Structure 1
Amino acid sequence: PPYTVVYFPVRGRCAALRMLLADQGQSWKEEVVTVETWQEGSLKASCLYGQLPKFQDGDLTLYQSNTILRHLGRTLGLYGKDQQEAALVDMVNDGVEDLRCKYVSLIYTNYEVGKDDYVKALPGQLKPFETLLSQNQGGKTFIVGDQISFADYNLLDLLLIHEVLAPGCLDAFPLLSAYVGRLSARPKLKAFLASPEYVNLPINGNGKQ
């Protein structure tokens, strides 16, 4: 497992998986796809769904951001202690994914006019993750069970990008707020989040956040 991440110079759908790799002490290569390389058409045509990210783990080539996360989850032991927890881990991640889709649609298709409506709906969209925490060790460990899972990284990223979109959207949610604090303070992750590798990438591709 030498790891490669093939993606545009943005945080987007590689942010969570980079946080996970960094926090887990994994080494990886960034293969940075410029607008020129994409436009030439060869790489795109070679991608299974015509999209990035693309990921290489030794001879295994993957596509789909959530597939990469589950693969890393499965192979690094970040997927709950048993089948019951693995199911709850999926349920969290599929929740994160649904909101990310709504986030991305707002960003890339309807930012100015749509933002009011999005932000009005946001407390209701965040509340389920507070609920999950309230029911797992009083919100003191992780989103599921007593160890970190790939869903924590993806939820973390969703929370961070939403604090940028709507400053203080976590204020009503003490468990969520504390959780962001705790996970962000994990020493290797902390270092990664403060690094120009992360800080100097835009969240999205169109200047909007």
Structure 2
Amino acid sequence: PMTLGYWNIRGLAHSIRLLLEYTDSSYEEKKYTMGDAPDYDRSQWLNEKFKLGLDFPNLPYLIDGTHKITQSNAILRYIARKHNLCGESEKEQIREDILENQFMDSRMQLAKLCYDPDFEKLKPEYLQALPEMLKLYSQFLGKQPWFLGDKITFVDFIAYDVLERNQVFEPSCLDAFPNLKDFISRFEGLEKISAYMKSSRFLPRPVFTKMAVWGN
């Protein structure tokens, strides 16, 4: 089987792990443990980092035969293409590309906050902006069952992760956006996803690394 390498946390492997399960992929997981503070020892990853045949050694990584991939977006697009889970038409491709980068931007803004020493001082400034962030997403989904329309594709897995981790951060953040809330239930309702969240494989905790002020 193929190998997914990540920290033993949720992080950037969440949507990947979900997609792998949705896709009925045969995979094992290489889980890396990071040291405590103050050092945050990374040595378990580091003995190994340049010895796996990765062009740009990074985490997450996926090995699949002669295919050795880093960058979370690339791993997603790789598994996605294998199972016809991408935007098919031109218009769908545009939305795919905009969403993948937007959600990445949203993901980073949350991490930026949760890793900064000034968490508490900067927290309210993020919560100010969050409704307006999600509003944009909600309008874009509209009445669609999925972000690219009638077809579920990979951006949905990125969407779920980003949306749901905001819900863990601010529990009522989606309440003002029914379509977003429905998207969570809909995605969590999918036969192979809810099977996997009912299993021992599943890992929603912790969100970030031991380095993070929030969710570590």
| TM-score normalised over the length of structure 2 | 0.87
Distance (whole Å) between structure 2 residues aligned to residue 178 and residue 15 of structure 1: 20
Task: Calculate the aligned-residue CA RMSD, in Å.
Answer: 1.9
What percentage of aligned pairs have identical amino acids? Answer: 30
Q: Distance in 2 between matches of 1:118 and 1:198?
A: 29
**CA contact 2:59–2:71 (8 Å) conserved in 1:** yes
The alignment of Structure 1 onto Structure 2 pairs a total of residues equal to 204
Counterpart of 1:24?
23
* Displacement of 1:48: 4.3
Q: Which has the larger helix fraction?
A: 1
Query: Residues 52 and 89 of structure 1: is their aligned pair in 2 closer, same or farther, counting only changes over 3 Å?
Result: same
Shift of 1:195: 2.5
TM-score (norm 1): 0.90
Give the unaligned 5+ runs of structure 2. 36-40
Moved over 6 A (4+): none
Partners in 1 of 2:121 and 2:28 — Cα distance?
39
From 101, 105, 108, the counterpart of 1:94: 101
1:122-141 paired onto structure 2 within 5 Å? 122-134=130-142, 138-139=143-144, 141=145
**Counterparts of 1:171 and 1:128 in 2: how far apart (Å)?**
15
What's 2:171 paired with?
167
CA contact 1:11–1:198 (8 Å) conserved in 2: no
Report the equivalent of 1:188: 192
Corresponding position of 1:39: 43
Q: 1:82 aligns with which of 60, 80, 89?
A: 89
Q: Are residues 14 and 100 of structure 1, via their aligned partners in 2, closer, same or farther at CA, if it must alter by over 3 Å?
A: same
Aligned to 2:38: none
Structure 2 letter corresponding to 1:96: F
Which residue is equivalent to 2:67? 60
Superposition deviation, residue 115 in structure 1: 1.3
Asked if 1:118 corresponds to 2:126, the answer is yes
Query: Does the CA-based 8 Å contact 1:9-1:201 persist in structure 2?
Result: no
- C-alpha separation in 2, matches of 1:30 and 1:59: 17
